[PDB]
């Protein structure tokens, strides 16, 4: 149904920071690079920004 964007296709865990992206059966998986941590969003999704704690 037309609500959500194609996870890995729309580039979620693919900012100028993040390291890895993986679509799942229940959404997607994100992985960061050395200097980044995952910042989860205000709906229940995730993407990478500079490592401090929860993003």
């Amino acid at each position: 149904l037309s609500e959500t964007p194609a996870a890995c296709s729309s580039n979620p865990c693919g900012p100028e920071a993040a390291g890895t992206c993986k679509e799942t059966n229940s959404g997607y998986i994100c992985r960061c690079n050395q200097g980044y941590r995952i910042s989860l969003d205000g709906t229940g999704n995730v993407t990478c920004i500079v490592r401090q704690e929860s993003g």
Binding site: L1, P5, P12, G27, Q34, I38, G44, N45
Partner: protein, 136 residues
């Protein structure tokens, strides 16, 4: 900050809130009081998580953690949960990883049990993040 310093702890998750855990583990297993369970197989270098009672856990590969890990849990609907894991890497670096479940099939505000925290474990409750994006 909620400094646990034990082997396990439990937080109250809420739709619109997040739960951050700074723990030091090598194989932490947690379950959420509605539907969520995972095993941070740090040692083997993979993160396994399921959504439901009896379900298969997906793996997100881990870049060889050293112990220090931040596990964050946020719900933004009912089933749509996000789990942030931030692990210190043995490879002279840090590595952070996450996964999201667009419909875990849960309802707002569930009790999250963090177990296997090892030592140095400390919890912090936050509010949910910002900017939606996932596939369902």
């Amino acid at each position: 900050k909620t400094e646990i310093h034990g082997d396990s702890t439990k937080a109250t998750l809420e739709e619109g809130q997040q739960l951050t855990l700074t723990f030091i583990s090598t194989k932490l297993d947690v379950a959420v009081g509605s539907c969520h369970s995972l095993v941070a197989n740090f040692l083997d270098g993979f993160l396994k998580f399921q959504t439901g009672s009896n379900s298969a856990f997906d793996v997100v590969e881990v870049e060889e953690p050293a112990g220090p890990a931040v596990l964050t849990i946020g719900l933004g609907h009912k089933g749509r949960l996000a789990v942030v894991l931030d692990y210190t890497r043995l490879n002279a670096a840090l590595g952070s990883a996450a996964y999201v479940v667009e419909d875990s099939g849960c309802s707002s505000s569930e009790e999250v049990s963090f177990q296997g925290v090892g030592s140095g474990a400390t919890l912090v409750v936050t509010t949910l993040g910002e900017s939606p994006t996932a596939v369902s």
